[PDB]
Amino acid sequence: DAASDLKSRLDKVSSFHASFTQKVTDGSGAAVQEGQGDLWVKLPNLFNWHMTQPDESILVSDGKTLWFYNPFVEQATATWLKDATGNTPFMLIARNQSSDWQQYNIKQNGDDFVLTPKASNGNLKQFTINVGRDGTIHQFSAVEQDDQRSSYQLKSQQNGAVDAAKFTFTPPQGVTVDDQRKL
């Protein structure tokens, strides 16, 4: 079905590099922010969303830990990546697991998909994505529990092995680290 069709199209492009424009709303239409950025993905769970405009930042997953670094405050936050599953759009695409797509109600129409959560086990209200049968993600968006909309419009995609270094992070000297990984 539409759920299996979605996992298959995404399996078409195991690793890639993409450029995106970000449009964030507020449920009230009044734009909250804007920006652009680069996205590196490597199925199963590696990804690196590196925004540049207006505020440069990095959300990188090494498969085990999720790192959020914002140089505008020497701040890096660390959480176990498993505690992040199904809470962000980058999470669902990166993971791209049957088990993930299962917890949603999906409606497809060509390359458009609209996913709505069945129960309550996440921070998302709605996730949409436009992916071609070739695995090419032209765009996707998300809506959190506070009706906030985050929409990403593709500009350029290049399937193919991605540099492994793009999926690692080491907190710099002098940077304040908030390691929320209980252990």
Instruction: Enumerate the domain spans of the chain.
Output: 1-183
Q: What distance in Å separates the CA atoms of residue 43 and residue 180, rounded to the nearest whole number? A: 25
Technique behind the model: X-ray
Coil, helix or strand at residue 181: coil
- Pick from 154, 164, 181: nearest CA to 21: 154
Contact 18, 129 (CB under 8 A): no
Distance CA 61, CA 47 (A): 5
CATH number attached to the domain at 1-183: 2.50.20.10
**CA dihedral for 36, 75, 174, 66, sign (positive or negative):** negative
Whole-angstrom distance, CA of residue 48 vs CA of residue 168: 9
> Residue 124's beta-bridge partner residues?
144
Torsion of CA 24, 27, 29, 33, to 10 degrees: -20
Rounded to the nearest 10 degrees, how much is the dihedral formed by the CA atoms of 93, 131, 128, 25?
90
Residue-wise burial string across 36-73, b where 16 or more C-beta atoms lie within 10 A, e elsewhere: ebbbbbbbebbbbbebeeeeebbbbbbeebbbbbbeee
